């Protein structure tokens, strides 16, 4: 038996989190990380993100999320 918490992400959930992150804005370390990306590349962006964080998987997750932000913002 697999708990229904295991199944997947509902549409309501992705909607909700997108709406939250829209209304929240970007934190000063995130406001930093966007400029560090745009300036000195994803390598240094990942380095700074991992230094801010503890592990590396959260670092790649953060960098991928922020690249999604950058792409969906600049082009649209």
């Amino acid at each position: 038996k697999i708990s229904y918490k295991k199944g997947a992400a509902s549409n309501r959930t992705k909607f909700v989190r997108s709406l939250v992150r829209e209304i929240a804005g970007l934190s000063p370390y995130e406001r930093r990380l966007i400029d560090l990306i745009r300036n000195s590349g994803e390598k240094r962006a990942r380095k700074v993100a991992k230094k801010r964080l503890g592990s590396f998987t959260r670092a790649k997750a953060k960098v991928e999320e922020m690249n999604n932000i950058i792409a969906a913002s600049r082009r649209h």
Binding site: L19, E22, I23, G25
Partner: protein, 187 residues
């Protein structure tokens, strides 16, 4: 007193420091006449009081009393709707042809999502000013929200035209100033 000092000191520091643009969407609110006609519209759709409810209940129970009772079928009631989780519930259907959101709520985080929610959903939301007056039109002390879904044919045209009006007065006027940081000027 301590609390008079606090409440006079409150609303000074908030304007002293930069409020986030998600706030100051509040207090950029509906103008005089338009709120006035909104409330005139609503006063036809007051909900039944507990007292009126009990009068009709005893009336109909007495109607069942007779031997020689009377049995009939009656249409749906019509009234605004006002409970917060219920108000959000009528959203995400959608059913709210109008939603009014009071600006002054001490836990403002109860309401910060509602403007953006109805914006993305296309519900014609409006920021009314004063939760107490919403309470007056709903047989409550305060409501903080006022949603309406079902409207009689005798007001449907009025509802649609008021919807276009609020779209003209709120969505057009203040969207670009909803779109900036407010406050930040010292007091």
């Amino acid at each position: 007193p301590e609390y008079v000092r606090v409440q006079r000191q409150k609303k000074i520091l908030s304007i002293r420091l930069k409020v986030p643009p998600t706030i100051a969407q509040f207090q950029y609110t509906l103008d005089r006449n338009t709120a006035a006609e909104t409330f005139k519209l609503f006063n036809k759709y007051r909900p039944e009081t507990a007292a009126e409810k009990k009068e009709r209940l005893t009336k109909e129970a007495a109607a069942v009393a007779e031997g020689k009772s009377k049995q009939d079928a009656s249409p749906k009631p019509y009234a605004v709707k006002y409970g917060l989780n219920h108000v959000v519930a009528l959203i995400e259907n959608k059913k709210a042809k109008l939603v009014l959101i009071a600006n002054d709520v001490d836990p403002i985080e109860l309401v910060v999502f509602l403007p953006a929610l109805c914006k993305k959903m296309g519900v014609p939301y409006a920021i009314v000013k004063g939760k107490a007056r919403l309470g007056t039109l709903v047989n409550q002390k305060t409501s903080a929200v006022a949603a309406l879904t079902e409207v009689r044919a005798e007001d449907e045209a009025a509802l649609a035209k008021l919807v276009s009006t609020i779209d003209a007065n709120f969505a057009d006027k203040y969207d670009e100033v909803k779109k900036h940081w407010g406050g930040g000027i010292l007091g």
